[PDB]
Amino acid sequence: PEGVTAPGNEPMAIPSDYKLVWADEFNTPGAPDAKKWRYDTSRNKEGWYNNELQYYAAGRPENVRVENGNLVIETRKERLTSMADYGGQEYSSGKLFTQGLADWQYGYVEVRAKLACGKGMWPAIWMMASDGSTGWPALGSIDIMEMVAWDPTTIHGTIHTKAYNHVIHTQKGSRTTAADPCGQFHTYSLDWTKDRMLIGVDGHAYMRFDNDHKGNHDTWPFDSPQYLILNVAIGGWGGQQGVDAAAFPSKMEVDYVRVYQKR
């Protein structure tokens, strides 16, 4: 298959000698836990990357709230023109991350989620290196789950490095089919060790990316902590077959995040 550059085909499970080090169960309705999550508003004025169309609203229950035991990130077609950091965007959405609060070097990450559909929507569950000194894409980024809702049953798992990234079409990725990802929950899983990453759905790794063992940061920048990111972008990749006005509002629901690490 054309762009499968990091194929996987093996089971994944929480190793027996790993412990739970961090979780959000999202069982307390209201605002996300401020000891666990912060809002990224860093590019609201300038505009987000990837020709994205959304404004990411902080402190707005209409975009980001915990209810019925899930985190909800909801896209809306509206101009939040009263925000000081407004960048002319036609849509609102949310982006949460654990940056500065919680980060991990190696481990087993599980995110149970139901995804946001409608042509335009680009839900993501991903990580970035806590030390961004080398910039993107050198620092290393981990896409545990991306979906673009013009192809809503296709789940993409991808890593980006300096040598291996989407700007030069060398990203290391795979994809699999999941049943109705916007109408039912699935478990999106990362098993990250010093020697390889597995990315999967419901216990099956469809992606594997190996440490080449050359000690080259350009091919393996993953020996340092990564923080977790939950977002629903609009346009860019999500807009390849257009943005449908009728598709707003749309939500991604996250039942839980669980992170495990070797004891």
Ligand X SMILES: OC[C@H]1O[C@@H](O[C@@H]2[C@@H](O)[C@@H](O)O[C@H](CO)[C@H]2O)[C@H](O)[C@@H](O)[C@@H]1O
25 marked as binding residue: yes
Q: Are 90 and 79 in contact (CB under 8 A)?
A: yes
Minimum separation from the CB atom of position 66 to ligand GLC (A): 26
Closest CB to ligand GLC among residues 94, 239: 239
By CB under 6 A, tell whether 143 contacts ligand X: yes
- The CA distances from residue 110 to 3, 107, 252, in Å, are 25, 10, 16
Given ligand X, ligand GLC, Ca ion, none, residue 49, with its beta carbon under 5 to 8 Å by kind, binds: ligand X
> What is the spatial distance between Cα 98 and Cα 36, in angstroms, rounded to a whole number?
6
Task: Report 29-58 residues binding ligand X (CB under 6 A).
Answer: 49-50
Which amino acid makes up residue 183?
Answer: G
Radius of gyration of the chain (CA): 17
Instruction: Please check whether residue 96 is in contact with residue 39, taking contact to mean a CB–CB distance below 8 angstroms.
Output: yes
Asked if residue 193 lies in contact with residue 216, where contact means CB atoms within 8 angstroms, the answer is no
- Please report how close the Cβ of residue 143 comes to Ca ion at its closest, in angstroms: 23
Q: Is 209 in the site for ligand X (CB under 6 A)?
A: no
The stretch near ligand X (CB under 6 A) out of 90-98, 141-149, 201-209, 214-222 is 141-149
DSSP letter (8 states) at residue 33: P
Interaction site with ligand GLC (CB under 6 A): 50, 143, 146, 156, 158, 166, 171, 173, 236-237
**Binding site annotation covers 235?**
no
Task: Quote the CA–CA distance of 109 and 228 in Å, as a whole number.
Answer: 9
Q: Which tokens sit at 31? A: 């605002």
Q: Which does 239 bind (CB under 5 to 8 A by kind): ligand GLC, Ca ion, ligand X, none?
A: none
Contacts with ligand X by CB under 6 A lie at: 49-50, 122, 124, 126, 136, 141, 143, 146, 160, 166, 233
Binding-site members for Ca(2+) are 25, 69, 255
